[PDB]
Amino acid sequence: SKTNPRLSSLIADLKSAARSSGGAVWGDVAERLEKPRRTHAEVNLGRIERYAQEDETVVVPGKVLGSGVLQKDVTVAAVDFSGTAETKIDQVGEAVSLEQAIENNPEGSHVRVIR
Amino acid sequence: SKQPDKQRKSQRRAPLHERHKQVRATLSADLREEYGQRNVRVNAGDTVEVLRGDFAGEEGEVINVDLDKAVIHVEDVTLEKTDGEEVPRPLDTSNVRVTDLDLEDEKREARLESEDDSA
Amino acid sequence: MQATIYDLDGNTDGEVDLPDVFETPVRSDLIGKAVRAAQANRKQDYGSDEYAGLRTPAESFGSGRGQAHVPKLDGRARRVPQAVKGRSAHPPKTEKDRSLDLNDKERQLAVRSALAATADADLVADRGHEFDRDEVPVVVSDDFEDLVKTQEVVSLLEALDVHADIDRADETKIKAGQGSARGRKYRRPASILFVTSDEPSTAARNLAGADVATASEVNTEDLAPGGAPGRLTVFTESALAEVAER
Amino acid sequence: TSKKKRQRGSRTHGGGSHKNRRGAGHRGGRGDAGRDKHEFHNHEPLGKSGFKRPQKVQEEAATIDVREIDENVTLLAADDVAEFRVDVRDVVEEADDADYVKVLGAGQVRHELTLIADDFSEGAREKVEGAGGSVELTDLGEERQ
RNA sequence: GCAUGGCAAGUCUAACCGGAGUAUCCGGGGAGGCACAGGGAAACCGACAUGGCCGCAGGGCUUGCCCGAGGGCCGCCGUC
RNA sequence: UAUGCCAGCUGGUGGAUUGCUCGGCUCAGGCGCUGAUGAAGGACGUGCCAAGCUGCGAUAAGCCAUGGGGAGCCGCACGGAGGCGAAGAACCAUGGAUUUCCGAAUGAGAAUCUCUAACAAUUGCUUCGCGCAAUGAGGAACCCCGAGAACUGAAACAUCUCAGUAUCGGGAGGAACAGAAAACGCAAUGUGAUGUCGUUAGUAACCGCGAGUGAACGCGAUACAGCCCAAACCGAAGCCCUCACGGGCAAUGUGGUGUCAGGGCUACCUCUCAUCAGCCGACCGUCUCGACGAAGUCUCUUGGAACAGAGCGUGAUACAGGGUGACAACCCCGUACUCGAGACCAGUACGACGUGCGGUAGUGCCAGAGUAGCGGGGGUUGGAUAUCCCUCGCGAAUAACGCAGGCAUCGACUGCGAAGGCUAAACACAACCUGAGACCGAUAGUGAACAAGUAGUGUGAACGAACGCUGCAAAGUACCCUCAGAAGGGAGGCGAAAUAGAGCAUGAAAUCAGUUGGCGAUCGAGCGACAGGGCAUACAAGGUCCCUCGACGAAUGAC
Ligand SMILES: [Cl-]
Ligand SMILES: [Cl-]
Ligand SMILES: [Cl-]
Ligand SMILES: [Mg+2]
Ligand SMILES: [Mg+2]
Ligand SMILES: [Mg+2]
Ligand SMILES: [Mg+2]
Ligand SMILES: [Mg+2]
Ligand SMILES: [Mg+2]
Ligand SMILES: [Mg+2]
Ligand SMILES: [Mg+2]
Ligand SMILES: [Mg+2]
Ligand SMILES: [Mg+2]
Ligand SMILES: [Mg+2]
Ligand code: NA
Ligand code: NA
Ligand code: NA
Ligand code: NA
Ligand code: NA
Ligand code: NA
Numbered sequence A: 001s002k003t004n005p006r007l008s009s010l011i012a013d014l015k016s017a018a019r020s021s022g023g024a025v026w027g028d029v030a031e032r033l034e035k036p037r038r039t040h041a042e043v044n045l046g047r048i049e050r051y052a053q054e055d056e057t058v059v060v061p062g063k064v065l066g067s068g069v070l071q072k073d074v075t076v077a078a079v080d081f082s083g084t085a086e087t088k089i090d091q092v093g094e095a096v097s098l099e100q101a102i103e104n105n106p107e108g109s110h111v112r113v114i115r
Numbered sequence B: 001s002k003q004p005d006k007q008r009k010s011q012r013r014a015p016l017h018e019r020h021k022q023v024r025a026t027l028s029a030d031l032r033e034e035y036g037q038r039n040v041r042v043n044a045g046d047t048v049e050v051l052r053g054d055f056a057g058e059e060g061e062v063i064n065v066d067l068d069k070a071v072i073h074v075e076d077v078t079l080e081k082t083d084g085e086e087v088p089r090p091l092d093t094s095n096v097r098v099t100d101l102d103l104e105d106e107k108r109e110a111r112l113e114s115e116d117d118s119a
Numbered sequence C: 001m002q003a004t005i006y007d008l009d010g011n012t013d014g015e016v017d018l019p020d021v022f023e024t025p026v027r028s029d030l031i032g033k034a035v036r037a038a039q040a041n042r043k044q045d046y047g048s049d050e051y052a053g054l055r056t057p058a059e060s061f062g063s064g065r066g067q068a069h070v071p072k073l074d075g076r077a078r079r080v081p082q083a084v085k086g087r088s089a090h091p092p093k094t095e096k097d098r099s100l101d102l103n104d105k106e107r108q109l110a111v112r113s114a115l116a117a118t119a120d121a122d123l124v125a126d127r128g129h130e131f132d133r134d135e136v137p138v139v140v141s142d143d144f145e146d147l148v149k150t151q152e153v154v155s156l157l158e159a160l161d162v163h164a165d166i167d168r169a170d171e172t173k174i175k176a177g178q179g180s181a182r183g184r185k186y187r188r189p190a191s192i193l194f195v196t197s198d199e200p201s202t203a204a205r206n207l208a209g210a211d212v213a214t215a216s217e218v219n220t221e222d223l224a225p226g227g228a229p230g231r232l233t234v235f236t237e238s239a240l241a242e243v244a245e246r
Numbered sequence D: 001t002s003k004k005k006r007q008r009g010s011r012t013h014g015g016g017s018h019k020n021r022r023g024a025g026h027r028g029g030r031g032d033a034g035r036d037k038h039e040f041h042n043h044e045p046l047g048k049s050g051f052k053r054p055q056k057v058q059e060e061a062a063t064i065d066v067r068e069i070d071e072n073v074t075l076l077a078a079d080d081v082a083e084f085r086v087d088v089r090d091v092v093e094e095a096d097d098a099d100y101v102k103v104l105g106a107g108q109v110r111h112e113l114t115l116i117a118d119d120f121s122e123g124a125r126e127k128v129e130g131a132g133g134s135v136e137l138t139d140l141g142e143e144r145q
Numbered sequence E: 001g002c003a004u005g006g007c008a009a010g011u012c013u014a015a016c017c018g019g020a021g022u023a024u025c026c027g028g029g030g031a032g033g034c035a036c037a038g039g040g041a042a043a044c045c046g047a048c049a050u051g052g053c054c055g056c057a058g059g060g061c062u063u064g065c066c067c068g069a070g071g072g073c074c075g076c077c078g079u080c
Numbered sequence F: 001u002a003u004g005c006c007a008g009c010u011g012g013u014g015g016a017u018u019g020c021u022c023g024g025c026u027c028a029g030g031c032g033c034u035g036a037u038g039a040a041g042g043a044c045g046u047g048c049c050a051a052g053c054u055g056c057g058a059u060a061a062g063c064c065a066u067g068g069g070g071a072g073c074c075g076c077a078c079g080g081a082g083g084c085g086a087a088g089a090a091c092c093a094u095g096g097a098u099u100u101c102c103g104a105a106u107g108a109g110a111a112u113c114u115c116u117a118a119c120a121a122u123u124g125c126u127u128c129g130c131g132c133a134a135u136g137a138g139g140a141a142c143c144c145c146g147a148g149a150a151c152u153g154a155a156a157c158a159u160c161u162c163a164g165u166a167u168c169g170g171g172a173g174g175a176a177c178a179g180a181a182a183a184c185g186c187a188a189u190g191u192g193a194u195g196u197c198g199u200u201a202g203u204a205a206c207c208g209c210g211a212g213u214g215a216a217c218g219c220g221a222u223a224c225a226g227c228c229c230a231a232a233c234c235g236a237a238g239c240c241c242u243c244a245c246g247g248g249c250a251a252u253g254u255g256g257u258g259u260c261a262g263g264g265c266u267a268c269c270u271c272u273c274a275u276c277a278g279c280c281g282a283c284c285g286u287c288u289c290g291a292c293g294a295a296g297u298c299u300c301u302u303g304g305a306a307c308a309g310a311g312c313g314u315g316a317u318a319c320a321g322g323g324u325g326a327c328a329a330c331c332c333c334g335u336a337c338u339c340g341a342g343a344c345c346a347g348u349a350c351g352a353c354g355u356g357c358g359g360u361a362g363u364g365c366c367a368g369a370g371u372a373g374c375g376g377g378g379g380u381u382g383g384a385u386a387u388c389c390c391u392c393g394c395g396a397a398u399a400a401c402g403c404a405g406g407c408a409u410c411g412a413c414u415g416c417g418a419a420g421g422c423u424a425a426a427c428a429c430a431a432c433c434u435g436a437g438a439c440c441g442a443u444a445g446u447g448a449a450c451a452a453g454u455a456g457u458g459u460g461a462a463c464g465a466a467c468g469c470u471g472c473a474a475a476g477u478a479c480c481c482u483c484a485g486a487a488g489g490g491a492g493g494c495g496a497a498a499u500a501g502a503g504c505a506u507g508a509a510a511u512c513a514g515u516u517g518g519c520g521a522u523c524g525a526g527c528g529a530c531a532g533g534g535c536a537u538a539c540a541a542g543g544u545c546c547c548u549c550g551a552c553g554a555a556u557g558a559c
């Protein structure tokens, strides 16, 4: 019983993509977002920096926060980013919405889930 | 106030001098132009035309004005009792229109013709 | 985007950039939350007399007279909730907090979101407003503030193919229920919202269902009456600009 | 629909036998009654322990870990840049209502730093120097002897 | 506790102040609270932005083999 | 088929339900003292007819003046009679007149009356005479000073808790109380009267260290304001009453000076805008009250009535609310705009009069005693060694001194001058006024929409109900018949409706009369559920059902 209309559409789009393309991540991410908010991911930059690798889109089934330092040049796809998170990321890489990610990579390939 | 109870209250309990406004009636087109007012306090001298009830269409002289009940008696506007006697059927002034005034009172006429105030 | 400006004759007279806020994603849940809060916050505290039903030394006779142990006085039952003339068990209480809190950020987000719903002709139409226009909201020259007569605003609205909404709101409803006994006999549709800059339009305010506001303090309710986003609005050249930094 | 809203007709409203929900007997006494007898379980144990020093003879240090400082070096552009130089006192929030500022050594230091503070931990120093940096003790900081 | 929603290494204002469409509402107010370090009665001291091994989901590949967030088992670090 | 069962029909009984609201409930803003010049309260009177309520007071629902108001009026209360009003009544506002008796109740006494000039009683002044004055009692709560429980919690109970609560005694005001540091003690190169609000904080502290109790400094705010004596040094330079004359007070000190930016004194510099006293005296704002105030009462149809439907038209700085024979911006009152008056803010702010701020040097001249402090015994508090107070006993210094900074003593350091006093504003309450409502809607909401603290109960303290609705208009039923009949009945008249005819909108159930269907005087009791037959059935809102035969034909399955 999610209340945010945009969250609902995102979740529906994620499913559409997983059922129609060579991707299982999107379906997976859809399932985690359907779970209660308290289980949603809250990841700071330090964690992305530690497990991300270039040319592998980092996918966060939640929201990205701005503690720590990101140096790698990666593309991070998340439900949302804090103002600072989005700022630090864009400086050395790129911040993208799961909505954009699903459109550029419906098959959801070369992607790494981080929480 | 905006509360219905208080509105009806202030009306039913208004002191006598404040009840004149409860017996006012609209003026004919001519009179409105003549005295620059839209209506007036019906007097026992005026002539009036009934515009609404079962007596709509009848005109007559106002024979009485009761401030206690805020109603008026108009000549010929009556009901026939059981014994055959004829009695007046009281009318609310808002259902009436003044077509002729009784200006025998200097004060009333002055008030009517004055501009700052109305009668 | 770009918004077309109109002069008091209803003729195009240039245009300006529709401020960014009008592109805020529409959030009906946040808007609904904001309205729900404003509506709750003006409600008055009430409750029954705390001693109602307790003004009596009534006592129970206990066992012995073949009667239920009910407090009685002068052979009449009293005080207890099951007794006629007895106290109310769990009545309305004055001490109850009837207000709703709302983080400033969450409320401000709703205002911007309600603002953005004003620029979507489809939403505005779905909300219910009647108009024969394509561009929305309606932006007019600041001379609008100098208008005085209500009918002058009528002409401008007719010339703007927007007067139909006022006709929609030109019908009151006499509500079902006892609200009438408390002064709430009527209610009527919400028509056009006029947002000016210096002071609310006295010339437009009496229009059926119309509301007037100022860019500095226009809130979620006038932008989305009842919490339903997409009100047919008419901004003022400068009002449009001031609203940009809300 | 809520749980409360579904109780009409149930008689006992989830209380079990209608003889249960009466007075405090149903709670074994009011408040923390029995915390040493029938309901001793999971209660802190009885007794006194320790002492307290008077509040106006107590010091409250304002601390900060090198990690915090170091991760925001560039961001702290509004502060010295040498061969960076930073007065921790001008960094730590709550630095006013504190008796002194102390730098702790939690985390890493990926820059050469010259830190000015009222006090440092053994580890904070070993780290700041180890990365080709230095540590400067304030005048107040000169209260170590 | 839980569900939903905002913001996030921060978050929220309280009284109260100005405005106004005047109990709503718009702006202001961060006092102070909780979180951002712990341990110790106290004096006082003051920590893993990752070192190892398993491995779910997911990803990759030449289809068993790599990468493996979260999680699991350890090391190691602060303090008594 | 009698007595009778079940369901319905017509008519009752009853007053549920629906709709309605002259009353409640709660919130908000404003405002806020009365009384010996006899209050508040009560009694008894007072009307053409007058029992209750309201008003009033032997001038008795009222008298007078000024302003408003206006052609009507003679309260609730819609009768009869009579009267008043253009000599401007009614009505409203302001001011005045009258204002019985009891009542603080005050000449004495008394269940509202009586007996023979009255501040009774206690005080101050005093012309020592009640000559001039004060006190007394009331008020919804709020406020200040005293007295002070228990049920209860601790699952018993004693300290503790409930709680300085309930209740009692005394007392002031519109608000009270507090208040210009012998403070604080984020210890400082720091803050700077006092309430209050938010926080500090369920922190420190207390406690059969149990249950529980529980601050402060500070900070952010609100509002802001600071002064006067005692003494030193002067020593009648003074005060009160009276028009005056004159009297009284006052050396046991009136008055000047002065008040920790210490002061006085002696010697100087300079200067006053501090303070204090008095004079004048608002704007604005807020609350209430009032004046003014736009635009349809057009056509047709329905209706008893148009405020309905359809058609045409209009105002709006006014589309809040109410009224009017039904859904009304435009019929009436109002509403927006504009304007006026009173009250509060406030005798405040500003302004002006007078006074005169301050600084140097010298001077042990002055600066509040059963006090500060200690001990015994109690209460109280978070106050723990370190709260505040009462009581018994003891008891200091003199600024070169003294108190404080959370155990005691001594030194240092920092703060500050007790034992005299006054003080605006910001805050509490809700009687009174006005406004408001996701509150109740007549077994509700007040006990009280009505005769309501009424009727009624009790020796008394005290206790205490129930009762709302004709109709558009009374048109509130003429005449006739019947009857012992102003009864009731019949017939009749009115109205859209009397199945609206008086507790008179609607009119449920229980239940009663009459009656329709089904059953019924040879038969058995949780009153039914499910199947199946009889009998009964206006329409509408359900339209299916039966028999031959044929098609399909699961498990099962023959003669
Ligand atoms: Cl993280
Ligand atoms: Cl401690
Ligand atoms: Cl301080
Ligand atoms: Mg005129
Ligand atoms: Mg009751
Ligand atoms: Mg209803
Ligand atoms: Mg006497
Ligand atoms: Mg006990
Ligand atoms: Mg006690
Ligand atoms: Mg015990
Ligand atoms: Mg206590
Ligand atoms: Mg303190
Ligand atoms: Mg009642
Ligand atoms: Mg009836
Ligand atoms: Na009572
Ligand atoms: Na409340
Ligand atoms: Na029970
Ligand atoms: Na501070
Ligand atoms: Na803060
Ligand atoms: Na008052």
Ligand code: NA
Residues within 6 Å of the ligand: F050
């Ligand atoms: Na009478």
Ligand code: NA
Residues within 6 Å of the ligand: F099
């Ligand atoms: Na009198």
Ligand code: NA
Residues within 6 Å of the ligand: F036, F119
């Ligand atoms: Na006297």
Ligand code: NA
Residues within 6 Å of the ligand: F130
């Ligand atoms: Na005397």
Ligand code: NA
Residues within 6 Å of the ligand: F155
């Ligand atoms: Na017990």
Ligand code: NA
Residues within 6 Å of the ligand: F156
């Ligand atoms: Na016991």
Ligand code: NA
Residues within 6 Å of the ligand: F159, F160, F207
């Ligand atoms: Na105890």
Ligand code: NA
Residues within 6 Å of the ligand: B094, B095, F324, F331
């Ligand atoms: Na009318």
Ligand code: NA
Residues within 6 Å of the ligand: none
């Ligand atoms: Na003592």
Ligand code: NA
Residues within 6 Å of the ligand: F404, F405, F415
């Ligand atoms: Na001190």
Ligand code: NA
Residues within 6 Å of the ligand: F442
């Ligand atoms: Na009743």
Ligand code: NA
Residues within 6 Å of the ligand: none
């Ligand atoms: Na049958």
Ligand SMILES: [Sr+2]
Residues within 6 Å of the ligand: B068
């Ligand atoms: Sr009358």
Ligand SMILES: [Sr+2]
Residues within 6 Å of the ligand: B068
């Ligand atoms: Sr009357």
Ligand SMILES: [Sr+2]
Residues within 6 Å of the ligand: C063
């Ligand atoms: Sr017994």
Ligand SMILES: [Sr+2]
Residues within 6 Å of the ligand: D013, D014, D015
């Ligand atoms: Sr339960």
